[PDB]
Design a binder for this molecule. Structure first.
Ligand SMILES: CCCCCCCC/C=C\CCCCCCCC(=O)OC[C@H](COP(=O)(O)OCC[N+](C)(C)C)OC(=O)CCCCCCC/C=C/CCCCCCCC
Ligand SMILES: CCCCCCCC/C=C\CCCCCCCC(=O)OC[C@H](COP(=O)(O)OCC[N+](C)(C)C)OC(=O)CCCCCCC/C=C\CCCCCCCC
Ligand SMILES: CCCCCCCC/C=C\CCCCCCCC(=O)OC[C@H](COP(=O)(O)OCC[N+](C)(C)C)OC(=O)CCCCCCC/C=C\CCCCCCCC
Ligand SMILES: CCCCCCCC/C=C\CCCCCCCC(=O)OC[C@H](COP(=O)(O)OCC[N+](C)(C)C)OC(=O)CCCCCCC/C=C\CCCCCCCC
Ligand SMILES: CCCCCCCC/C=C\CCCCCCCC(=O)O[C@H](COC(=O)CCCCCCC/C=C/CCCCCCCC)COP(=O)(O)OCC[N+](C)(C)C
Ligand SMILES: CC(C)CCC[C@@H](C)[C@H]1CC[C@H]2[C@@H]3CC=C4C[C@@H](O)CC[C@]4(C)[C@H]3CC[C@]12C
Ligand SMILES: CC(C)CCC[C@@H](C)[C@H]1CC[C@H]2[C@@H]3CC=C4C[C@@H](O)CC[C@]4(C)[C@H]3CC[C@]12C
Ligand SMILES: CNCC#CCOCc1cc(Cl)ccc1-c1ccc(Cl)cc1
Ligand SMILES: CC(=O)N[C@@H]1[C@@H](O)[C@H](O)[C@@H](CO)O[C@H]1O
Ligand SMILES: *[C@@H]1O[C@H](CO)[C@@H](O)[C@H](O)[C@H]1NC(C)=O
Ligand SMILES: *[C@@H]1O[C@H](CO)[C@@H](O)[C@H](O)[C@H]1NC(C)=O
Ligand SMILES: [Mg+2]
Lengths: 268, 983
């Protein structure tokens, strides 16, 4: 079918015309698609999303986050510092963003109430965001313990709630972290936790989040859960739940919605 | 052979005797040397091999290869850290399931058709009369051995191939084995060289009609004439159907496009940093993507619907592919006796009152009648009614006269039926005219005589009525009856009678002469002693009533069916074993030879010149007999076929019918064969489609044929031609509709691989589109009406007009499919942007998006998402892409209704099935989107109403673009636009 005069059943002039027609067709279609995308992006609001259909309840993440086969798995040896050196380094890297120099774009907040802002009073047409420094975690801030309690077998875990634009957890009381054994071992007592800040609360003045354009310096408030009575040389499962009026943790299809669960083994 | 070989030289080969026969021990030993005198059954085809055949096929094999490639890809992705590979298993299972269920459907169709055809198949044990060592006992037919002495009488079946030694008025029915419509005399003398033409050979499967005969068995079982025809049919190979060829061509197009696309994106994946295994997996993914899973089901359903429509007209196909062949047929080779004609002798013409009249020969009496108001007609009718001995079987009031069963020979049966149709109550009239003397028909005088008395009590004469050969009657009959007169023979009546006789003879009709005489009451008083041996009555000086001629006439619908076939551009050739004169007369009667068409012999007779000095190119018609065909080489046969458009083959053997079919097929034509007898079975098998008469058809013919006309209605051929052309066009439309949606199902995967956006469309939703939502709309296009006078078009050129061609493929894939892809991606980006993911952030996001270890990934607003939330957003993207495809497919099915006409011209809602299919598609889409549990069962999401509206302008654009394209084709008939944009 290839030839000299008619290549694949078409003269060279005919190929030119049909190819030009297809080029014009695809140019017109691409222009229509580009116009549709431009119109969409001009209808989009730059501060608030149109819908939050998949964001009814915030996710919960934990640091240090080491994943095994299915989910978070943290195992180390109190005798061997090499086992928890990486975990401590991860925590230090994470708290570098909560250093006071990193918190320069935020302000001190003391209201302990929803920080509602209807105007852009902060510099460069921005809304204010509240400060959160590592020192509010105290014993789990990395000072005076750079190992975050891992050397002594009382590790610190930092719990963070996923931020959602204009989400309100509930203002009767501050949202609070509660960590417990998923299945309490019958050879020991229930889990004993000391929280930082005290009682493991996220202050209400960190809410609502107004988005990245309105609050470029926003920082998620943190809660540190220092586990005090983890049995040695045994595999335990720990679940840290968020207790708030508008936060649900009962989703069979999202094990990170409103809570975080991890496996922990501390060897000696 | 044995026929040109005297009884002296016989009885030595066969070690028999004409008087005694064979010894019992010799017969029993020959019965052990050879087998029983029976035909071998057509052997084979176990019930699972048919199912395996249904599982085989071009589209089926493409799907088998696609499933195997899916399995290989699953194995390769399990041999590494790819995983998440349930999609390959789902798709392979879907492919295999579609193939298997479609094969089950096809097998059921063939099984049901086989049962329908066998429901009209009977079975009977056959016995024979044999004379061995002087004892004339009865015996089973298959007990016979070669050289046996056999006796047969009227009404029996001939028990084997027999060389006649004695015969007394023996006639046989050879219409099934040969093409001979008229009963054939069997005599104990050699009359022709060939055994098929001599009078001293009677054949195995035929029926003795009247008289008695004695003969020697010369062939037995599979070595008889019918056994050799069955052997010849067994050696004929059945070719692929035209629709199978078209499907294979379309599969080749699909495979080539898949290979090109997959290779190009394999290279792209290599160049953008993928590994060899990853790129190979992508290439095989694309190749499998180009295979449409539901198209096999759509095609099978459309063919079954056409088959059901044909069966509504008593036309039963043995396989679904046969419903298309008549649409593509360009040559019909038709048998004459029993197929074009009724295979029944009936009164056709009469000669009385110096005029030639025409009678109604149709089996339903729907034709025109002659003038039945004349004293000459009354006398002729009385003569032909009284000089008859046939009788209708008792209790035949419901069955019409042409189909009533009669105890008598063919000529007397035809005369009796003609009497019943014209006068009415022929037997009542006969018994009202009592008979007092009768000389039956015999060869010494070659006529039949009878004497009757008048009905009225006031008339003492005795009426003489005579029937016989026209010349024997004319040697008598000093007078003639013309319009209430008794004109003496003035030699002008003699020349007129001779002219009429040769005219009716040249029309290929058997002619009989009728006459009467009124005996005086004085010379022949009442109660007269009429003595058959004294010959006292006058057998001369009679009065001639008229001539009556008979022919085996065409079936009623045949002439109009032939005219319609030739209007549709189909060439009709007659291939018959009958005699050339009868064949030519019937061909003229049915329209195979047109009015004014002439053969070289006709031209020579008109121009008073020898035939060798006649230009062949001036003869539109041609009649070739078997002896001339034997001497012809294939080049001469091709030359004759191309020279003469109106062709008749007469005295044609089954092998020569096969040769003619093969020559026509070699010239490039799709050939249909219509036949009924055993002599047609090899040609029927060789034909691209074989059509057999349901009622007249022999078992060999019905087994060889692809299509059976259960009511013997020849107009079903015209119905089949129209339905085949319609199904060809509608399959074109349905295939275009099905192919269009493959591009919007593939492009999201290509964008996913190359740009790394989150997956816009899933395997499960693709399966739902292919197998659930679109199959009913695709099938509904089989109910579209023709866009033109489809019966006035020529047959399509098989090598040029393909079912699926380059314009159809290009249009469907890369214009409409491209628009659908753009609609889907517009909806995808709208759904992402309105939920927080801007288009530029979507680019390259796939690794983070699919990372199970990232549970706080940030969107365009800084919100942090878990993996499960991102997965539900991905399911929303699946759903919006699915709905975009569905909305565009509504417009696609609307624009697919016509290829040239406007939707406004053809009618938006004339196809109620299509309207229902659209409503049903929308309902299933809504159910999938909004039934609870769908997100976790099939990953469909309850999408917002504005995602439904986003693709609607794209669907409207599809409709408007197709409407403008088809207006360009109608306004500019042969422009560049018609050449490139029409399909
Ligand atoms: C054989 C020929 C094939 C041709 C295929 C199509 C070619 C063209 C495709 C892409 C080129 C660009 C098209 C888009 C043009 C966008 C028009 C525009 O001006 O928009 C502006 C946006 C940026 O606005 P912003 O977000 O900053 O505004 C924020 C507003 N505030 C601040 C208020 C929130 O720019 C953008 O989004 C740009 C986003 C473009 C990239 C999207 C991902 C690419 C995916 C393409 C798949 C298409 C497949 C088509 C089907 C093929 C069938 C064969
Ligand atoms: C023709 C139909 C072919 C037969 C079906 C072929 C595939 C067989 C099959 O296994 O099909 C399953 C899919 C949906 O799989 P799933 O989401 O239930 O799997 C969940 C698996 N788990 C629980 C591990 C998450 O069903 C489908 O695609 C159905 C696709 C549409 C066919 C409808 C019938 C056409 C008439
Ligand atoms: C074209 C018309 C076809 C009609 C076919 C016959 C009708 C069958 C349809 C429905 C009958 C059963 C209806 C369901 C039972 C009553 C409703 C109910 O009790 O709801 C309870 C929950 C609601 O779930 P949700 O709204 O929270 O969803 C999850 C949302 N997410 C994304 C947010 C987390 O249900 C669950 O939890 C999951 C419970 C199991 C899922 C529902 C059971 C029925 C679904 C599938 C059965 C087979 C259907 C497929 C057949 C082949 C394909 C056509
Ligand atoms: C959606 C995307 C749409 C994008 C379309 C861009 C493509 C532009 C097409 C331009 C058409 C060019 C044209 O006009 O070709 C004129 C030719 C002249 O050939 P000739 O007779 O001299 O050669 C006959 C003798 N030979 C063949 C031996 C030499 O053919 C004729 O005159 C026949 C009549 C041609 C004009 C009517 C058909 C063309 C209209 C196309 C517009 C379709 C889309 C409209 C926009 C979208 C709305 C839904
Ligand atoms: C051709 C003949 C058609 C006859 C009618 C077809 C069947 C209609 C029957 C039922 C559909 C309506 C009821 C279910 C929807 C509400 C359930 C719900 O709740 O939807 C909710 C909102 O609903 C809506 O925005 C509107 C719903 C209806 C939209 C349009 C429906 C389709 C209509 C098509 C007509 C097209 C006609 C033109 C083309 C065809 C021409 C012939 C969705 O939930 P969400 O996104 O807030 O959840 C977010 C949380 N997440 C995602 C995790 C679960
Ligand atoms: C630059 C982009 C938009 C494409 C180029 C412009 C398009 C819309 C126009 C400009 C020139 C046009 C071509 C001019 C000549 C011919 C020859 C004719 O026999 C077929 C149409 C065809 C092939 C036209 C197709 C459409 C065309 C290519
Ligand atoms: C749209 C993008 C992919 C075009 C990229 C350039 C190449 C691949 C394009 C440019 C012009 C095109 C051709 C234009 C016209 C025809 C004639 C048609 O009967 C077969 C395909 C065919 C449709 C196209 C094949 C692909 C093609 C050669
Ligand atoms: C009409 N075309 C449809 C399509 C497509 C493109 O890739 C196929 C595809 C898509 C998706 Cl989402 C998931 C898996 C596959 C897929 C991958 C490998 C094989 Cl061997 C077969 C199929
Ligand atoms: C501005 C800044 O960086 N930090 C301020 C600090 O000046 C202030 O004195 C104290 C509370 O009053 O903490 C906060
Ligand atoms: C926390 O720190 C204070 C002083 O720095 C100390 O008294 C207290 O014991 C610490 N708690 C734990 C659990 O180490
Ligand atoms: C690690 O823990 C195990 C307890 O299972 C202990 O036996 C071992 O000594 C520890 N490693 C080192 C380096 O001590
Ligand atoms: Mg016949």
């Amino acid at each position: 079918n290839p030839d000299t005069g008619q290549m694949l059943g078409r003269t060279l002039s005919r190929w030119v015309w049909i190819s030009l027609y297809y080029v014009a067709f695809y140019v017109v279609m691409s222009g229509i698609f580009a116009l549709c995308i431009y119109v969409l992006m001009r209808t989009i609001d730059p501060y608030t999303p149109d819908y939050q259909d998949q964001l009814k309840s915030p996710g919960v993440t934990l640091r240090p986050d080491v994943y095994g086969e299915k989910g978070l798995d943290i195992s180390y040896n109190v005798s061997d510092s090499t086992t928890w050196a990486g975990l401590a380094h991860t925590l230090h890297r994470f708290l570098a963003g909560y250093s006071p120099a990193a918190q320069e774009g935020s302000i001190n907040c003391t209201s302990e109430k929803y920080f509602f802002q209807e105007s852009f009073l902060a510099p460069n047409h921005t809304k204010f965001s509240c400060k959160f420094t590592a020192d509010m975690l105290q014993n789990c801030s990395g000072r005076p313990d750079p190992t975050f309690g891992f050397a002594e077998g009382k590790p610190c875990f930092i719990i963070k709630m996923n931020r959602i634009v204009k989400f309100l957890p509930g203002n009767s009381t501050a949202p609070r972290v509660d960590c417990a054994f998923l299945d309490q071992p019958r050879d020991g007592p229930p889990l004993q936790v000391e929280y930082f800040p005290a009682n493991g609360t996220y202050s209400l003045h960190y809410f609502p989040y107004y988005g990245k354009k309105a609050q470029p310096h926003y920082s998620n408030p943190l809660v540190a859960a220092k586990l005090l009575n983890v049995p040695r040389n045994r595999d335990v499962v720990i679940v840290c739940k968020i207790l708030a009026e508008h936060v649900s943790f009962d989703n069979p299809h999202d094990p990170y919605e409103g809570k975080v669960e991890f496996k922990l083994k501390i060897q000696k | 052979n044995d026929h040109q070989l005297s009884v002296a030289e016989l009885e030595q080969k066969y070690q028999t005797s004409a008087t005694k026969g064979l010894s019992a021990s010799l017969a029993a030993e020959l019965l052990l040397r050879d087998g029983p005198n029976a035909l071998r059954p057509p052997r084979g085809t176990p019930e699972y091999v048919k199912f395996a055949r249904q599982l085989a096929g071009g589209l089926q094999c493409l799907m088998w290869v696609a499933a195997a490639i899916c399995l290989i890809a699953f194995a390769i992705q399990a041999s590494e850290g790819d995983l998440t590979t349930d999609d390959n298993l789902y798709l392979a299972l879907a492919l295999i399931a579609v193939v298997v269920v479609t094969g089950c459907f096809g097998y059921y169709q063939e099984f049901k058709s086989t049962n329908i055809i066998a429901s009209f198949k009977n079975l009977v044990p056959q016995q024979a009369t044999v004379i061995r060592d002087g004892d004339k006992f009865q015996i089973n037919a298959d007990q016979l051995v070669v050289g046996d002495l056999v006796e047969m009488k009227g009404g029996d079946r001939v028990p084997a191939d027999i060389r006649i030694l004695q015969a007394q008025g023996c006639k046989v029915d050879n219409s099934s084995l040969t093409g001979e419509s008229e009963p054939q005399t069997r005599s104990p003398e050699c009359t022709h060289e060939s055994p098929l033409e001599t009078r001293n050979i009677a054949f195995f499967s035929t029926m003795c009609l009247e008289g008695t005969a004695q003969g020697l068995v010369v062939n037995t079982g599979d070595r008889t004439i019918i056994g050799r025809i069955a052997s010849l049919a067994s050696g004929v190979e059945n070719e692929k159907t035209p629709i199978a060829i078209e499907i294979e061509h379309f599969v080749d197009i699909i495979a080539g496009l898949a290979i090109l696309f997959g290779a190009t994106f394999f290279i792209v994946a290599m160049c953008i940093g993928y590994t060899f295994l990853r790129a190979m997996v992508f290439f095989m993914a694309i190749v499998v993507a180009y295979v449409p899973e539901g198209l096999l089901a759509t095609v099978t359903v459309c063919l079954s619907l056409t088959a059901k429509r044909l069966a509504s007209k008593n036309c039963v196909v043995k396989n679904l592919e046969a419903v298309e062949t008549l649409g593509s047929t360009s040559v019909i080779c038709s048998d004459k006796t029993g197929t074009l004609t009724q295979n029944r002798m009936t009164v056709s013409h009469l000669w009385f009152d110096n005029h030639i009249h025409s009678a109604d020969t149709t089996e339903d009496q729907s034709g025109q009648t002659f003038d039945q108001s004349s004293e000459t007609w009354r006398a002729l009718c009385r003569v032909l009614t009284l000089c008859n001995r046939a009788a209708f079987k008792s209790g035949q009031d419901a069955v019409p006269v042409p189909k009533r069963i009669v105890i008598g020979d063919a000529s007397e049966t035809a005369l009796l039926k003609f009497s019943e149709l014209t006068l009415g109550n022929a037997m009542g009239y006969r018994e009202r005219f009592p008979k007092v003397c009768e000389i039956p028909f015999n060869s010494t005088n070659k006529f039949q005589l009878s004497i009757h008395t008048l009905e009225d009590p006031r008339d003492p004469r005795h009426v003489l009525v005579m029937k016989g050969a026209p010349e024997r009657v004319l040697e008598r009959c000093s007078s003639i009856l013309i319009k209430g007169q008794e004109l003496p023979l003035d030699e002008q009546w003699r020349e007129a009678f001779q002219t009429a006789y040769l005219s009716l003879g040249g029309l290929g009709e058997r002619v009989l002469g009728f006459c009467q005489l009124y005996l005086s009451e004085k010379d022949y008083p009442p109660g007269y002693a009429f003595d058959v041996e004294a010959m006292n009555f006058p057998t001369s000086g009679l009065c001639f009533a008229g001539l009556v001629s008979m022919i085996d006439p065409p079936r009623a619908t045949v002439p109009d069916a032939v005219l319609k076939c030739r209007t549709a551009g189909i060439r009709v050739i007659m291939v018959t074993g009958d005699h050339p004169i009868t064949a030519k007369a019937i061909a003229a009667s049915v329209g195979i030879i047109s009015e004014g068409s002439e053969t070289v012999e006709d031209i020579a007779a008109r121009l008073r010149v020898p035939v060798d000095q006649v230009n062949r190119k001036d003869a539109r018609a041609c009649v070739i007999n078997g002896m001339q065909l034997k001497d012809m080489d294939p080049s001469e046969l091709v030359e004759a076929l191309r020279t003469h458009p109106e062709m008749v083959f007469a005295r044609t053997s089954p092998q020569q019918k096969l040769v003619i079919v093969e020559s026509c097929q070699r010239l490039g034509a799709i050939v249909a064969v219509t036949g009924d007898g055993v002599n047609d079975s090899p040609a029927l098998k060789k034909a691209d489609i074989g059509v057999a008469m349901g009622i007249a058809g022999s078992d060999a013919a019905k087994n060889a044929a692809d299509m059976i006309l259960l009511d013997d209605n020849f107009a079903s051929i015209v119905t089949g031609v129209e339905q085949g052309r319609l199904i060809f066009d509608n399959l074109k439309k349905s295939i275009a509709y099905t192919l269009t949606k493959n591009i919007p199902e593939l492009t999201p995967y290509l964008i996913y691989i190359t740009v790394s956006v989150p997956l816009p469309l899933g395997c499960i939703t693709i399966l739902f589109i292919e197998l659930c939502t679109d199959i009913f709309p695709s099938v509904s296009l089989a109910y579209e009406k023709a866009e033109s006078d489809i019966m006035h078009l020529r047959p399509r050129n098989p090598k040029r007009d393909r079912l699926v061609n380059e314009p159809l493929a290009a249009y469907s894939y890369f214009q409409i499919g491209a628009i659908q892809s753009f609609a889907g991606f517009t909806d995808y980006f709208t759904a992402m942007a309105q939920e927080g993911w801007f288009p530029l952030l979507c680019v390259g996001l796939r690794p983070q998006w699919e990372n199970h270890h990232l549970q706080d990934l940030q969107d365009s607003y800084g919100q942090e998402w878990t993996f499960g939330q991102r997965l539900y957003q991905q399911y929303t993207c699946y759903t919006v892409f699915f709905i975009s495809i569905e909305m565009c497919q509504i417009a696609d099915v609307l624009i697919r209704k016509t290829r040239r006409l406007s939707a406004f011209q053809q009618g938006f809602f004339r196809n109620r099935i299509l309207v229902i299919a659209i409503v049903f598609q929308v309902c299933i889409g809504c159910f999938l989107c909004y039934c609870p549990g769908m997100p976790n069962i099939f990953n469909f999401m309850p999408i917002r109403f504005q995602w439904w509206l986003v693709p609607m302008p794209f669907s409207l654009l599809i409709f408007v673009y197709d409407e403008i394209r088809k207006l360009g084709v109608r306004c500019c008939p042969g422009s560049w636009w018609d050449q490139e944009l029409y399909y």
